[PDB]
Amino acid sequence: DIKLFGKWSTDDVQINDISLQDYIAVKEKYAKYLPHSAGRYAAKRFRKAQCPIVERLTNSMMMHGRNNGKKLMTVRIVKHAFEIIHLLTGENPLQVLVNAIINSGPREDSTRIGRAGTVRRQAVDVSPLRRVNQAIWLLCTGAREAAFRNIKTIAECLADELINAAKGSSNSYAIKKKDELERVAKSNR
Amino acid sequence: TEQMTLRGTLKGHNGWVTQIATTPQFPDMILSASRDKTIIMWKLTRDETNYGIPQRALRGHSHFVSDVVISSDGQFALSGSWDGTLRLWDLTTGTTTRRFVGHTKDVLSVAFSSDNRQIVSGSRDKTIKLWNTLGVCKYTVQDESHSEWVSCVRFSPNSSNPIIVSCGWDKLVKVWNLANCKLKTNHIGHTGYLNTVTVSPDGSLCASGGKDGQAMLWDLNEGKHLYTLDGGDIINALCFSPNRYWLCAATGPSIKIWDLEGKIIVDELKQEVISTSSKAEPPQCTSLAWSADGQTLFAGYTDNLVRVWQVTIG
């Protein structure tokens, strides 16, 4: 009866490996029924890295100057029509839910060279979190512009957001923008 | 000569034990002293299946107390902390009954006279006073007073005549009757500090504590020097057997038990847990509280763990 949410559970989702919990980590007090836990992610570096990627995903829509930070907005977004989709799907959306975004992710970004010259960039990488969530931030911009002056709006992209959340395969768009940049800057190895 | 065997462990607490006090007349109230506004009860079971049960958590005390003393009757607990305050607790009501704020200086100890006649406290005016319950001046001695703070005043720990045994941290020991209160002998220039003095049940000994560990032994009529029992670091506990003549104290890691005819330990056989890290410092022991007569012993440390053992005495 320690089952996560009212629907999920922590007793059947096992990987038999304790090296691959960098995307979903539900084993302690950090498990959240609803992400409105408050908190400050800018108090110190390595704390926005300590974020749960669900919370970072939903909150990082805090952009423009008028919709910035308002946690009521993100909690209402992730509650509304998620309450509908849970009873409207019945089956498992897990396949796409994981299999587009959470290994669409790139594998390298770049850095500046020497002291001058804005014509190419030395290819580097990070332990996956920073690069995946930089793709996530550019995807925040991308999903916004897919809503911003567009047709599919906010508080109704719950399918695509669960995709942007969960675990491991490749179909994304701003991530393939990042992968074009990946190859271009990776020609320097 | 005493053989014991550790039989178990105890898990679950918040406040490590500091001071010990019990009355054989009423054994239903057992108390423990802590540092987090916390006082915890015990009970007696002597079971391996159940060697401890958290039942009642006494609160109320704003400051971490120094010496807790119970009256002859197991009904009143006096916990006066390091400000001059006090807490009077009665089991008849389960709350506070008498809160006194009357001393404007930093007092360290408070005690009940065994005959419930006068109240003694240590003040920083180079003077000792005797106080009543009516707030009326009785006896203030300005001459030949202690060189520094008066630690406390002790009385007999059992059903026997009360004798005033004044103690201080200024390494001065005074024992006064109820009639004379006359300074007989004074000796100064001592190597180690004085923690506190203790009262003997047979009325011939008064040991003391200090970092030098040298047990101070004086008679009752005068200040004749008798013997200097050895010791370890700062001593915080001394007590005899209730019917037999022995000295037991815990001035550090191990147990320092001396028989006054032998004065030395016999055989130190102990049980300590193993640590997998080369830099994990073990805790520090303070006191050994006999359960009822010397058959069983309890102890507490700085590891949120309470260590107990079963002793056969002989």
């Binding site: - | 000796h187 220039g189 190597t191 020097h225 200097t228």
Partner: protein
């Protein structure tokens, strides 16, 4: 500590040439009681009570005539 350890006086002296201003600052000594100086010490000053000379024999032995 400059608020209660230093007392300041600024005064004007009028000469035929003009005005010269004088400024006298005194750092009071620490003294309990007497109102000669402030009661509290300098907050960066830590005090220790000093022991006395102890040249004693190995063991105390009572002496009687």
């Amino acid at each position: 500590p400059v608020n209660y350890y230093v007392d300041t006086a600024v005064r004007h002296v009028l000469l035929r040439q003009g005005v010269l201003g004088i400024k006298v600052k005194i750092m009071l000594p620490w003294d309990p009681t007497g109102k000669i100086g402030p009661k509290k010490p300098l907050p960066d000053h830590v005090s220790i009570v000093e022991p006395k000379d102890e040249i004693l024999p190995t063991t105390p032995i009572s002496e009687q005539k």
